[PDB]
Every structure is written in C-alpha cells, then in structure tokens.
Amino acid sequence: PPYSYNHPTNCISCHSNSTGTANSQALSGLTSGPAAGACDPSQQECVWSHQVLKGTDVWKKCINCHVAIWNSINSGPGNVHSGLLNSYGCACHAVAHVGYGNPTDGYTACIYFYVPRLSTATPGYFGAKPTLDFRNVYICFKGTPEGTYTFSGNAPTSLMQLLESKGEVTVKALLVGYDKYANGTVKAKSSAADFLETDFFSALEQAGIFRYEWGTASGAVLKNPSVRTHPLTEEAPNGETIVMGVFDIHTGDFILVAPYAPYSRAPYYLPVAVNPGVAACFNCHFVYQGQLG
Amino acid sequence: PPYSYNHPTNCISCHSNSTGTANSQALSGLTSGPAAGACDPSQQECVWSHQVLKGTDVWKKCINCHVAIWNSINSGPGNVHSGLLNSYGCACHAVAHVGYGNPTDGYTACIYFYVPRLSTATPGYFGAKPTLDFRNVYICFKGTPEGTYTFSGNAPTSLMQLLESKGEVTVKALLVGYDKYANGTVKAKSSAADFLETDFFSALEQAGIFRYEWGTASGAVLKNPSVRTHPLTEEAPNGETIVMGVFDIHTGDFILVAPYAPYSRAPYYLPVAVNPGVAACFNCHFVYQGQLG
Amino acid sequence: PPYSYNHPTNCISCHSNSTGTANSQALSGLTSGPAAGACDPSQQECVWSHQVLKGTDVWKKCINCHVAIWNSINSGPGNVHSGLLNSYGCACHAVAHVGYGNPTDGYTACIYFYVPRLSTATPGYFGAKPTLDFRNVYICFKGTPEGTYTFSGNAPTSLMQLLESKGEVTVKALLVGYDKYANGTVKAKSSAADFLETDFFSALEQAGIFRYEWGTASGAVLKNPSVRTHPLTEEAPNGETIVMGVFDIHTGDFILVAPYAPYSRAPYYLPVAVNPGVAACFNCHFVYQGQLG
Amino acid sequence: PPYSYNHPTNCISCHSNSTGTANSQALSGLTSGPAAGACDPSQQECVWSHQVLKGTDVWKKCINCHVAIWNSINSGPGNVHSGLLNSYGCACHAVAHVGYGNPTDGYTACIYFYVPRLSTATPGYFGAKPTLDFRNVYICFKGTPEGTYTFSGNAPTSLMQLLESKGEVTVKALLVGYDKYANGTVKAKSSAADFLETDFFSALEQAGIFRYEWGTASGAVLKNPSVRTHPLTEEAPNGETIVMGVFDIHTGDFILVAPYAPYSRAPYYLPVAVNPGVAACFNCHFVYQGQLG
Amino acid sequence: PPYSYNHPTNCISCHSNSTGTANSQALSGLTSGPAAGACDPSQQECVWSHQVLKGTDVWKKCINCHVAIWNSINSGPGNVHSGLLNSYGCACHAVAHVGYGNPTDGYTACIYFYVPRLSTATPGYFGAKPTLDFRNVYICFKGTPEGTYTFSGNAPTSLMQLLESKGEVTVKALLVGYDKYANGTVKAKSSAADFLETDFFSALEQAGIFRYEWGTASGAVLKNPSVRTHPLTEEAPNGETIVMGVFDIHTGDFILVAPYAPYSRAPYYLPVAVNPGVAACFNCHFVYQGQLG
Numbered sequence A, B, C, D, E: 001p002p003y004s005y006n007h008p009t010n011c012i013s014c015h016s017n018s019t020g021t022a023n024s025q026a027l028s029g030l031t032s033g034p035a036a037g038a039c040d041p042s043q044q045e046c047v048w049s050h051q052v053l054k055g056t057d058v059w060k061k062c063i064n065c066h067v068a069i070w071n072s073i074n075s076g077p078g079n080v081h082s083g084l085l086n087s088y089g090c091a092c093h094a095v096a097h098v099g100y101g102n103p104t105d106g107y108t109a110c111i112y113f114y115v116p117r118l119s120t121a122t123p124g125y126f127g128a129k130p131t132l133d134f135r136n137v138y139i140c141f142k143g144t145p146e147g148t149y150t151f152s153g154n155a156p157t158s159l160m161q162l163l164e165s166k167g168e169v170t171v172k173a174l175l176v177g178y179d180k181y182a183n184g185t186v187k188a189k190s191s192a193a194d195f196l197e198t199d200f201f202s203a204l205e206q207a208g209i210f211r212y213e214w215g216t217a218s219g220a221v222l223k224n225p226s227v228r229t230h231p232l233t234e235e236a237p238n239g240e241t242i243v244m245g246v247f248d249i250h251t252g253d254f255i256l257v258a259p260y261a262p263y264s265r266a267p268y269y270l271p272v273a274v275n276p277g278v279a280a281c282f283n284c285h286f287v288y289q290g291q292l293g
C-alpha cells in the first residue's frame, strides 16, 4: 500500500480530472453501459475509466481539494499571481514521486517542477519579473541514501552540471519544537529550530516535522479540543510516497514546507531566523539572461 | 535557502499583512474550509492564502515586528514624523532585494525607496521641509562585483544620469572595532572605524559589521551575560539576501545602518567623526525646486 | 555621507537628548521589547526610537559633549551668563544647516540663532543689558555661490530688508598663518592674517582655516607629540555639512570662530588687529528700542 | 566684525584674565577634557571657558599687553601712583564702549571711569591729594550724532545734572599736522593744531588723528624705515568700536589721547599751547568737599 | 581741557624730565617693548612711561624750554646766582596750581615756592645774603573769590599767622596801557598803569595784562609784523590753570610778572613808579634771625 509522507498519495485524484461531476470524463460504465465521459453517477452506477493525464494538464487538474487556495489566488486576495496559475496551474510547487525502498539497494525518485524560460525577450533582460513561459521541466535520479547519485532528465544543462558536481540532492526544512503526549496531543514550544539538512533519500527515514498542532488548551494558536488537523508527519522508510514541497533550482535543494502559516512567527522559530520554505520565488523574481533558468 | 545579511528574509511576513490576527486576510482553509480571510486559526486549522502585496501597502504592512518603534513615532516621542509614517509607512528606509550569486556571472538586485516630489508647490520653493508626496520609486540593476553596471527603472532622470555616469552603486558603513572570542563573546574597542567604501555587489563578501555586543562584563554598554542580541552580521556571499539600510539619492550611495544607538558616541568611533547612517534626511529637509528629487 | 566642515554632523546627537542614560527617552526596543524611553541599554538591547526635537529644547539638549564648557558657564567661572544659558541653552551661537552641492544649480541652507526682543520694557529703553527674551528666530535662503540670493523666514523685518538689499550673506574669519608638513604636523607662524571675506556659499570651497596645532616641538603653544587635537578643517565642496559659528544680525555676517583661545594673542594675528569671532555680543549688550532686534 | 577706533576691540583679552598661562582660568577642555581653569594648553588642547568679568577686576586684568607701562608705574619710575594702580588698576583711564551705527536712528554707548569719593574724611577737606576710594562709577547714554541726548547711570548727581543741562557729551583732541604719502609714509609738520571739539557721536565720523609717524627719514623723531608703529587711526563710522581716552568729570568732556609722548613738544603743536590729553588729573589732585566728585 | 592763564599748562613737560632725549627715562614701550627709560624714540615707537616727580627735582627738571635763561644764569651774564640755581633750580619763582571753577562754590589752589632758612648760622645773623638752604615749602588754601579763606600747609608759622589774620591772599601786577585792534594788533601807550590789587581767586576773572606787543610799526619796541610773540593773556574764569609769578612771603602777596623787560621803562609805566614784579628778592637779601623766614 502507498505511504503518506506529506501529501495524500491518491494517484487517481491528482491525475484524472475529478470523479464526482456530472459528465465525469474519468467515469465509464462498468460492463456495457455508457462510454467513458458519459455516465451520470448520481443516476447510474459507473466506474473509473482509467484516465491518466500528462503535461501541464495535471497541474491545472489538481483542483479537487484546495478550493479555498485556488479561489484565493484566482480573483481573490492573491490576485497578483492569477495570470500565472490560470495558465499553468500551480507552477511553483515541486512534486517528487518516489518508488520502493530497502535502502540496501537504493530507491528511485523523480522530481517535477517549473523553470522560467529567458532565451527570448531581447537578450540582456535583467528585470524583476519573469517572462510567461516555464516549460514544465523535470528531473529524475537513482541512488542509495548514502553517497553517490546518478542523474538524468531534460532539465537545463546548467542545473544538470551543478547537480552532477554536487553528487546529491539535499532536503532542508524548519523543525518547530513540539511536545507529544500519550493521547496524541501535540503542543509547540517557544525556542527550537533544529534545522534540517540531509540527503533527499535519507529524509525518508525521519519524521520530526512539526506541521501544526492538534491538542487542546494550547498556548500557541490552537484552542479547540475536537478538530481534525494534520499533526507531525509519518516516516515511510521503505515505501512508495509522494514528497511535496518546492525545488530551489539555484542550489538543487528540495525544500519541504514544514511549518504552517500560524507557526512562522518569531516566538516559534527563534534560534533559526530564516524559514527555508519561502525560497522558490528567488528563481522567478530576480532572474537575468543566464543564471540557471 | 535564503540567507540573512542584515534583515530576516521572511518574504511572507513583510508582504502578507500578518498571520495571527482573527480575520487574517492572509489565511485560508487548507482543503475545503472557509475562503481566504475567513478562518479562525485559534479555532480551526487554516493555511497561508498566498497573498502578496505591492505598492505603498507593503511599507505600511511591515508592522508585525518593530511595534515599539512604530508606536514611538506614531503618537510617541517621535511625534514629529507621525504624519509621514501614518500615510506612507516607513518612507525613508531603503529595501534592497538581491538574487542569486556565483560572482563569475554577476548577480541581480533591485532597490526600493522614496523620493520627495517637488514639481508642484509654486515653482521656486526652497523651504526646509518637503511637500507630502513621495511616489515610492524604485531602482534595479545588474552587474558583477567588479567594474561595469547596467541600470534600469523609473527613477527620476536626474538620478539615473548620475548613476549611469558613475557606473556603479557604492555601499558605505561605519565599522566599530570589536573583539571576537571563542565562546561568541563580542566586545567593542575604544578607537577603530575602518570606514567602508565598496561596490554594492562586493559588499556581500565581507561581514565585519560591528552591530552591537553580545558578551558579558563588557565595558562599553552591555552587562548581562544571558541575552539574545544581534551580533556581527553574516557573509552570504552567493545567496539570496535582503540588504536593508538607507539610500542617499544625492550621490547614489546605499548606506548600511551598521552601528546601533548605544554605539554612536565619541569614545566608540573616534577616528572617523561622521556616522554615514544618518544621511538620508538631507534628501528631504534641504530640498529646492531642482536638485535630484 | 555627511561631510564635516566645522562641527560633527551627527544629526542624532544634537537632536535626540543623549543615548546612553538609564531611561534614555531616545532608545526603544528593537522588535517587541519595551516601549520608547523604557529600555536599559546596559541590561538589554534596544535601538534609537527615532526621536527628533524642535524649538528651544534642541539648544539645551546639546549637552552630550562640551560638558566642561557647560559646567564652566553654569555655576563656574562663567557664572555671569548662567541665567541665560540655563533658560535658553547656548543662546548666542548660530547653527547653519546646509544641503547638497553641485554649484552649477545652487545649494540650500538655513541659519538658526537668537535675536533679543525689546518691544516690551517701557519704550525708550537704551540699557547696556538686554531683556530676557530671545524668540529663537531663524533665516533660510537659496542661491548659487556667485551673485544673487533669495531670502525667506520669520526674522525681524529690519534684518530681512538689510539682507535683501545686500543681496548676499557674507562669511568672515581670521586665518592664522600655518605651515603644514608631510607627516601632518601643523605649526603656526608669527605674522599672517589673510582676513576672510566671501559669500557664504563660496566659503564651502576653501579650507585654509588654521584652527589650532597638532605637531610636536611647536614654538607657539603645543609641545606634546601624541595628542588628538583638531587641525585645519576640511573643504566639503558639494556636500551636506553643518557650518557652526556666530551670526552678527547687525550686518548679516555669518562669522566663523576660526582661531582658538591660545591662538588669539598679538604675536599670532598681528597684521589684522581685530578678531571677527567675538562680534555677536554687540547685538546683545548695546541695544536700544529700535536697531535690528 | 568689530572696528578699531583707538584700541584693539578684542572683547576677550580685556575681560577674561589672559589666555596663555599655565592654570589659565579662562581655558577649559573642548569636549570632555579637564574642567575650566585646569587644562595645560602647552600639553593638551583646550578652549576658551567663556569667562567674563565685571567690576574692579577688569581694570586690573588688563595686564596682558602694556607690560612695560605696568612695570613702569609699579615699582618703577612711576613709583608715585603705585599705591593707586596696585589696588584699583588703571583707575584714571576712561573706556567708552560703543554699539552699532546708521546715524539716522542713533547709536548707543556707555562710558566707564573712576570718580574720587570725598563724603568721608572730616568734612571740610581741601587737600592736594584725594582719599583712596573711587567707586568705579559709569555713565551710559543714547542719541544721534546731531542734537539731543538721553542720559542714565549711577554717576554722582552733580555730574548728571551738568550732563543733562549741557545736552551732549563732547570730544576734544589735539591734531598734530601730518602729511600722508602714497606708500603709507606719515610725516608730521611743524605748525598745525586744528583743535577738536565735536559731539561724541560725531567724532566717530572723522579720523584725522595724527597719532605718531610710520615713515622713513622723518625729520621729527622717527628714522628707521621698517618698523611696526600705529599711524593715524581709522574712521569706523557705523560700527561697534571701543573708544579709549580720559573723561574729565568737571566738564563732561571725553578727551582722546591723540598725540604720543615724542610729539608733545613746542615745535609740533605750536598754534594751540595746551594739550587736552593731560586734563584728568585735575579731578583728583585739586579736590574739595563738594565740586563734582 | 586745561586753560592757559600765564604759563603752558602741560602737566607732563614740567613734571617728567623731558621726552625727546636718547635714554628718555619718561618713555617706555607701548605694548611689550623695552622697559621704561630704555627705548629709542628715533629708532622705535614708545610712549610716555607715566613718570611723575615731586620735590626739588621738579624745579631743576623744568629745563625743557627756557634754555636761553638757564644758560644765562649758569655760567653766563647771570653768573652771580649760579650757585643757587644749579643746586635748587629756579628757587625764587612761585608756581600756583589751581583747580576747577564755578565761583558759587569756591575753587581750590595751592602755591609752591621757596623760603630762606636761618635757624642755623650763629643766631644773631643779619647779613645781606642768605644761607644756602631753602626747604622748598608750600601753601595751599580753599575759598570763594569773595571774602573768607581757609589755609593749610607746612609753611613757617609766622607766615601762616599773617595769612590767617589777613584772611585772603592778594594778587598785584602792573598793567601797561595797551590798544587792541581788530586784526589782533596790540600797541602799548605812553602813560597808563592801572595798578592791580585783588583777591587771588578774583584775579582769574580779568585778563587786562599787557604782556608785550604783537603788532607792526609799533612806536614802543616792536617793528617786525610777522612774529610769534605772546600778547595779552587769557581769562580762564572757571577752569584749571597754572598761574605763575613770584610770592612775597613778607606780605603774603602773589605777584604776577605782568610786563616784560623791554616794557619796564619810564615812558611806559609813568603813573605808577614801582614795578611789583621785582619784589621777591627782599625776602632773600635783607634777612635777619627772625622776620618771616
């Protein structure tokens, strides 16, 4: 069975354009019913049509959850980036598919993200905004949790050279200090960071990520005892997971978005002043003709 | 990961209008919860709504730290400049965003500040105070740490001409002599200035800025051994930082506020009589019709 | 950066009521510490509270250096003028703020001083002492180093008329002959005056002011080789300076206090018998009902 | 700037008890050095302590020049008047401070001198010497160069009545005939007096006073071409001067000491037999109980 | 100013031992030059040293004018009295200093002369010559021009008693008749005496003394039109003068030497046969043990 590391590993929901709508292009009759994309699930039984998507459609077709954020960026309080998302989906989050375990042999994982394109637009361009083209490039590699890596893909050669010279891909995240109790209560502390810096394939071994609270009478943010939040993540040490975060193409670092918005304030990560999560946008907003784009 | 040069490079806190308040316009439900600006983080889990701000709002929305200074100027002991700040935010500090490194190719950085406007107000005006309009103009440029620069922006043409003729933007700061010990103790000396004057992009290489003390039994100001101060800054030589200071539009010099208030007295910077930090206000308080405004 | 012409151009020290005292009304916590005027710099880190002062307070709040002179006048050997200084500060020295350069366009400078008030006190008063009221009036003007000037302010109309008719404000000082050597040694001669008489804005171009000695084995006063004195001043030809001296309201002449007390004796300024520095007190001690007060 | 009429108008030298001595009560450290009256100018830099003196001390503290005359009277060839000078300073010379000009409005000037006191000493005293008490009284007045005057002060009522009845104070001096050449040579003639008699405030307009020679091959006294003497005085028509001479309290006439000792012989002032300069001593040496003392 | 009655009232020339000689004990440097009695006026500027003399020196030190008469008596045609003058100066002329005026109150005047001493030299001496000792005694008094007088001094008691009994001191002189013309011509008549006999203090009111001629084509003595003689004296009615003559101690009469040698012949004073001027020598040449010496 698939294991959850940071995201629900429902390979159908993220790849098949919803399941509950009327026409439901992903739904088809079971035995001899209507052809694919024609049944009415509210009026007749029909089954998944085995639809799989590739390319930029997958980024856009991830609006099955996160309706609030999608509406927030599209004609909401995030109106600025509306042009980018409405044309390329979530064009700045990196999805890292991972396959199998047993660290004795070495796993296999690919990383998918976007890279701004700048070969056009009157060479010599050094603006504070990028041109609207991103090529949806990807990187995939194989290796053991310790030591060497082998790279492949169609990423820009400048990033491939950096990754080959480095020899590994690193993962860094911010670990808000937390206290775990017997009944599952998770309360955050006031001064603890324990900055993460490990190989990507050794990051599958540890699950000390804070990622919000779930307790009661907590002194930081949460106060309601009976809610369904998402506390500290799971280990998943030799399984098939979907690691989600952002990929800083400048240094080849896959960064996890470990803390949430209410837990990115000074009295909660004081020892380490920086939050690694917000680092992708420097590969978009301060570009020039060369660099690594 | 973002690097800290003089300011916390938390790109969300300075651009998203707080995160912990009740309504919390920057907070939105994670999967299908309340729309953006409607969750209660103390009563339900919700996530950053990807809100980004541009214009004069960003200057005003920087009241998430520095509550003491904001209250000091607004109806406090800094009551004089209350009219300016309450309408334009911190209208005299310059924020210099910087992107990427590897000085072989050259970085890219922009500078944001304010410039008094004087085209109105009965031509021939030569008062000791400026008119209340500042246009929040910006300058951005690209170049290597050594030699030539290329400029662009919407700054007044008089300043653009000076910057193009000069060919570079310089950084100057006051370096109070300090002694660094093994245990991190930093004690200031009695006579050492070592005035800074370097290209802006070569200022990212050196971190000899004094910027307060952190030791114990210090003979200058500090006496308490266990406090969390901010000692000498960090290098950040090929990273994405946020350099903060003031920009003197008269000479195109980006000035760092290197020493703090307790360390701007005669027995602490004696060899160099002037403190470069307090130089912005000459572009506001002694203006005339032309000049560089 | 600010330039030094005759005084340290530390715009905070002269305008913010000290920085090192316990309560330290000008000091405030950095991020969320105690409010302004409440931190203890010897026990906790806190920063300048952006306090700026206007009016008669600025004159009194200049006791951060010059403790010896302040104590000399207040209940010392200068006991006579103790009543005036303790109520109005240094009420006879003129401070001349100056802004920007490039003499092609023309600078902008204001002058601040005191003027005795005599409209009261039984009209017909022609005593040898003035009444204790001085109104702390100011004059500001704009113009190029050559030729015309434009005046404004709230000074008494009699002085404004004289300044407009004259068309310029002149600067005069006594230049004790000096010899400058390679190693910085400055020795005064026996007969050289070279009386100064130039427009105020052309006085920023030349720095031939003697202003004490710094050498060794000097035959005039100084004998110790290793001391920190203040030798001949600096040019500062297109910068923001703070010119300090006295303003003779009778002729509208801004007079620099060029020589010091040990160098105002006959064998050191013989060719010119008068010392222009001591000329302010004729606007206080020999007044009548009209005049220019 | 102050103007010289007959005396160096150095208001500090005559009022501040020297400047070059070791202890130097008038010298104080500049910024934070030793307190007033404690610096060593030959070993450390220190500045005028703003010391001002009033009363009989000012008369005694004028020994900073005129060392030869002071030693001549004190235990020298002027041994007779040694008792008077050692106790009251120069008790027979009159100092007349003057303030401002523009004769359209009228100036303001005070006169300071000594008056013998005779109310004691067995009424009926008509000796040829006065009693040793002089009260250092003063007279000050205001008026235009033409016509009326207004008097005030604490002088004996007998002199005040005479001055009010007269309506003006007159100045008289002896003008030795002189010839002035292009190169500054001044040679005295053999028969020319041109006795002076004018209002005090109209005496500031003319500068025909002989007051010694400065030429070469002169047939009267001087023979050396290269000396620094004091030739004919200056006009100073609307300025702040210090007129020095003697005040004959008998007639209220301020008398200038116009010619020097070598030029008070018969072949140099023949037309007028009397020299007005030596007229003060009749108010000391031939007094009685009443008179104007 | 001093007034001239019969003698130049130059109080310095008669009291300070010349001014033009090389060593010039009465001359001293002005500001810091050579000490008193050491300057060379022909080679350097120096000023009166305020030297005043008392005693028998003043009589001898009156050789600054009258060189002809001094040489006439000393080893000349007046060889007889050479012993007296060379040891006591002009020991038979009386000098009468006078002070102030306004005859309503009364003036004050002293008289200085010589009195032969005869208490020694074998009591019973009645020779035709006096012994060589004269004691340089003086008399001073106060009184109004009319009526009573008050006497004091150290004169011999016999003369004091006579003066007190008389109650006044009288002045007598011979008035040669003269005619005064518009152009200043003064011509003497042939028969007019108008003998003077008045109180000393009322003699200051009238100036009808002949005292030589100044005209042209005069029939008495003078023939040259252009000469500088000394015609009829001046009034000086309420001033400070120096009355010069001889004092006849026998009757206490101060006698003026009114006519000169060429005008003491019979056809010029015919009505009064005696000339009062030559009356002093009867107090020297016909003395005895008692009398009034």
Ligand code: HEC
Residues within 6 Å of the ligand: A006, A007, A008, A010, A013, A014, A058, A059, A060, A061, A062, A063, A064, A065, A066, A090, A093, A230, A244, A245, A256, A257, A258, B030, B031
């Ligand atoms: C349905 C279920 C979806 C779909 C179709 C997508 N997401 Fe999202 N996601 C989902 C859940 C329940 C959560 C909570 C995380 C948890 O339970 O542990 C998330 C979280 C994220 C995050 C935060 C990652 C982290 O905190 O470590 C991101 C960045 C994210 N999801 C992105 C994302 C994108 C880009 C999608 C479409 C391309 C997308 N999700 C779809 C549930 C669901």
Ligand code: HEC
Residues within 6 Å of the ligand: A266, B006, B007, B008, B010, B013, B014, B058, B059, B060, B061, B062, B063, B064, B065, B066, B090, B093, B230, B244, B245, B256, B257, B258, C030, C031
């Ligand atoms: C939250 C965290 C913020 C926010 C939202 C702003 N600042 Fe400020 N700032 C912050 C810290 C922790 C510090 C300490 C500096 C350090 O840790 O090294 C500062 C400092 C400054 C300074 C001093 C710069 C220097 O000493 O070199 C300035 C001038 C400053 N901050 C300005 C500033 C402005 C103008 C802001 C809003 C527009 C602002 N800050 C927001 C923390 C925080």
Ligand code: HEC
Residues within 6 Å of the ligand: B266, C006, C007, C008, C010, C013, C014, C058, C059, C060, C061, C062, C063, C064, C065, C066, C090, C093, C230, C244, C245, C256, C257, C258, D030, D031
């Ligand atoms: C701290 C630093 C101060 C403060 C707060 C004031 N002064 Fe003063 N001042 C200071 C220095 C180091 C010097 C030396 C001058 C030099 O380095 O070149 C001075 C000098 C003066 C002078 C002399 C001016 C001259 O010689 O040309 C004056 C007249 C003077 N300072 C006046 C003054 C007044 C009136 C102040 C308060 C209102 C004042 N100072 C404050 C240093 C400092």
Ligand code: HEC
Residues within 6 Å of the ligand: C266, D006, D007, D008, D010, D013, D014, D058, D059, D060, D061, D062, D063, D064, D065, D066, D090, D093, D230, D244, D245, D256, D257, D258, E030, E031
């Ligand atoms: C220092 C400089 C002093 C001081 C402290 C005093 N005097 Fe004197 N004085 C000085 C100079 C250089 C001169 C020359 C005059 C000139 O340059 O024109 C004088 C002159 C006088 C005179 C003569 C006045 C005349 O000729 O018209 C007098 C009477 C005089 N000075 C008096 C005087 C007194 C009474 C002082 C102390 C109370 C005194 N001076 C101080 C220079 C200096």
Ligand code: HEC
Residues within 6 Å of the ligand: D266, E006, E007, E008, E010, E013, E014, E058, E059, E060, E061, E062, E063, E064, E065, E066, E090, E093, E230, E244, E245, E256, E257, E258
């Ligand atoms: C310099 C000037 C002197 C000095 C130092 C003395 N005298 Fe003499 N004197 C002087 C003048 C110019 C005149 C002319 C008189 C005039 O101008 O009206 C005189 C006159 C006399 C007289 C005659 C008095 C008379 O005619 O009424 C006498 C008796 C006399 N002078 C005496 C005298 C004595 C005793 C002196 C020294 C002790 C002396 N003089 C000095 C000019 C000068």
Ligand code: HEC
Residues within 6 Å of the ligand: A007, A008, A009, A010, A011, A012, A014, A015, A054, A055, A056, A057, A058, A059, A062, A095, A097, A112, A136, A137, A138, A242
């Ligand atoms: C929550 C999101 C999400 C989930 C869950 C997910 N994917 Fe994807 N997948 C993506 C996105 C986004 C892309 C876009 C890659 C591109 O556009 O090039 C992608 C692309 C792919 C590709 C294309 C690779 C290529 O070279 O074209 C494959 C294969 C794939 N996914 C397999 C899987 C499998 C197998 C699972 C589950 C068992 C899975 N994915 C689950 C988001 C997801």
Ligand code: HEC
Residues within 6 Å of the ligand: A080, A081, A083, A084, A091, A092, A114, A129, A130, A131, A132, A278, A280, A281, A282, A284, A285, B011, B015, B052, B053, B054
């Ligand atoms: C993957 C690309 C990408 C990333 C990552 C990204 N942006 Fe942008 N951003 C854009 C583009 C494209 C635009 C211009 C949109 C347009 O012109 O329509 C833009 C515009 C903006 C603007 C407005 C610029 C203007 O001139 O008005 C702001 C502000 C901004 N972004 C902030 C941010 C911040 C803050 C981050 C990171 C926290 C970020 N962006 C991350 C692509 C990106």
Ligand code: HEC
Residues within 6 Å of the ligand: A128, A278, A281, A282, A285, B007, B008, B009, B010, B011, B012, B014, B015, B054, B055, B056, B057, B058, B059, B062, B095, B097, B112, B136, B137, B138, B242
């Ligand atoms: C502590 C303050 C601060 C931080 C941190 C900060 N900014 Fe800004 N930023 C500002 C201010 C102030 C402005 C105002 C510029 C204006 O008003 O024109 C601004 C403006 C901008 C703009 C607008 C440029 C334009 O032309 O309109 C962009 C893009 C931007 N920031 C990007 C970023 C990114 C990306 C980060 C972090 C990864 C970041 N900023 C972090 C203060 C900050």
Ligand code: HEC
Residues within 6 Å of the ligand: B080, B081, B083, B084, B091, B092, B114, B129, B130, B131, B132, B278, B280, B281, B282, B284, B285, C011, C015, C052, C053, C054
């Ligand atoms: C970016 C613009 C700006 C800067 C920088 C600035 N000021 Fe001002 N200042 C103003 C304005 C605008 C006013 C007038 C406010 C009003 O009229 O309401 C003012 C007013 C003042 C006043 C009061 C003037 C009066 O007539 O009462 C003082 C004092 C003052 N400033 C001091 C300073 C000092 C000191 C500095 C530098 C250390 C400084 N200011 C920097 C904009 C500025």
Ligand code: HEC
Residues within 6 Å of the ligand: B128, B278, B281, B282, B285, C007, C008, C009, C010, C011, C012, C014, C015, C054, C055, C056, C057, C058, C059, C062, C095, C097, C112, C136, C137, C138, C242
């Ligand atoms: C050493 C002394 C000193 C220094 C340094 C100094 N000032 Fe001042 N300043 C004064 C004094 C004194 C006044 C008093 C004026 C008054 O009372 O009217 C004053 C007044 C002012 C005013 C008030 C003008 C008005 O019309 O009310 C302004 C604005 C000002 N200063 C600006 C500055 C600036 C900007 C700087 C430095 C960058 C500076 N000053 C540095 C002494 C100083």
Ligand code: HEC
Residues within 6 Å of the ligand: C080, C081, C083, C084, C091, C092, C114, C129, C130, C131, C132, C278, C280, C281, C282, C284, C285, D011, D015, D052, D053, D054
């Ligand atoms: C700006 C005004 C001002 C200036 C400039 C000034 N004074 Fe004064 N001075 C005063 C006042 C006011 C008093 C009277 C103080 C009192 O009555 O309490 C005074 C009093 C005096 C007194 C004592 C007067 C008395 O009757 O006892 C002396 C002496 C004196 N000043 C000397 C000087 C000298 C010397 C100077 C110049 C070198 C000078 N002053 C400059 C204002 C001034």
Ligand code: HEC
Residues within 6 Å of the ligand: C128, C278, C281, C282, C285, D007, D008, D009, D010, D011, D012, D014, D015, D054, D055, D056, D057, D058, D059, D062, D095, D097, D112, D136, D137, D138, D242
């Ligand atoms: C060369 C001598 C000299 C000079 C120069 C001089 N004074 Fe005086 N001053 C005196 C003397 C002597 C007195 C003594 C008055 C007394 O004792 O009553 C005096 C007294 C005074 C007084 C006291 C008035 C009173 O009523 O008590 C004042 C005020 C004064 N001076 C002002 C000045 C000023 C202002 C200057 C120059 C700008 C100056 N003086 C220059 C010699 C001088």
Ligand code: HEC
Residues within 6 Å of the ligand: D128, D278, D281, D282, D285, E007, E008, E009, E010, E011, E012, E014, E015, E054, E055, E056, E057, E058, E059, E062, E095, E097, E112, E136, E137, E138, E242
């Ligand atoms: C032309 C001659 C002459 C002139 C002019 C003159 N004196 Fe004298 N004075 C004398 C003589 C002679 C004595 C000698 C008295 C004695 O020896 O006792 C004398 C003595 C004195 C004495 C001494 C009195 C005593 O009791 O010892 C005084 C005082 C005096 N004079 C004052 C003056 C004054 C004041 C002036 C002018 C302003 C003046 N004199 C002008 C000739 C003169």
